[PDB]
Design a protein around this ligand. Sequence first.
Ligand SMILES: CC(C)(CO)[C@@H](O)C(=O)[O-]
Ligand SMILES: [Cl-]
Length: 300
Amino acid sequence: TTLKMAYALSTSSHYGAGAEAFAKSIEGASGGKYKVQQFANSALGGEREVIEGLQIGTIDLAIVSTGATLNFVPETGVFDIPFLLRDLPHARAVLDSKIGQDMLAKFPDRGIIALAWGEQGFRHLTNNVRPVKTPADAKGLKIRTTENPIHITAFRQIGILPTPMAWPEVATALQQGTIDGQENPLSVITSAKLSQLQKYLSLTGHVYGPALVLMSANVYNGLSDAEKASFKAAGKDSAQAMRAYVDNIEQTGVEQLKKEGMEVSEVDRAAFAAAVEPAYAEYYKKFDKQLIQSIRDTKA
Ligand SMILES: CC(C)(CO)[C@@H](O)C(=O)[O-]
Ligand SMILES: [Cl-]
């Protein structure tokens, strides 16, 4: 059985590393009973369509951001609150804990199996208009966001004009100048060639970007208990490969982007965190305050 695995970016990206690790894991475990064929570079559409495909069973596997997943499992949105997950060790500890694992168990009610929390890293603001050194500098910029309402609410707080847009639209819109910028981690800014589309980078690190390794219920439900365990294991191997890719690009990424001609600014992240904090008025209408505190207090 050849399973079809979709993702948005190149085979040399963190998604590619994750998909390759998944493929090797399941092919080895299954003695070749299951093989993975990769559909990179958004060939099967935007992430929303990919998730819809898993629900119907036309796509078997995927690695996606949390850009479009709140339309399916809104409860996970808590992880998308700017500055809540503080750094890579904290984010990983939270997602690997019962807090994160309990969230994965919410997907099957929607016809989706969530095998593991993978990773993109911390998202940064890019644009074509001017350097952004302070939150004031960002006001008035037309910045593309994902479809994620938690992100959109945050950016409104510093006067950004957000335009939610699926990923396949972004390069064209940047070139056309209908949006001034976007935000994504070093892993994406490098692998998606955004230095060719964006003059300025500010290292806001405003939110951790998780990823999800997903599988169709169609396929998963058909498996034995041993086979289900092997897909969960491959999910974990995929997540580890993504985290290792991120650990590496976090060391080299800014240097790479400067070489490619980007003007990179460090910022005072505490100023940005303070500027977006009033959005908690909205977040507390969606998420339990005690869950948010438990995330804060998760160690490591
Ligand atoms: C680039 C991306 C599709 C990766 O999942 C996502 O981070 C997004 O939509 O910005
Ligand atoms: Cl897991």
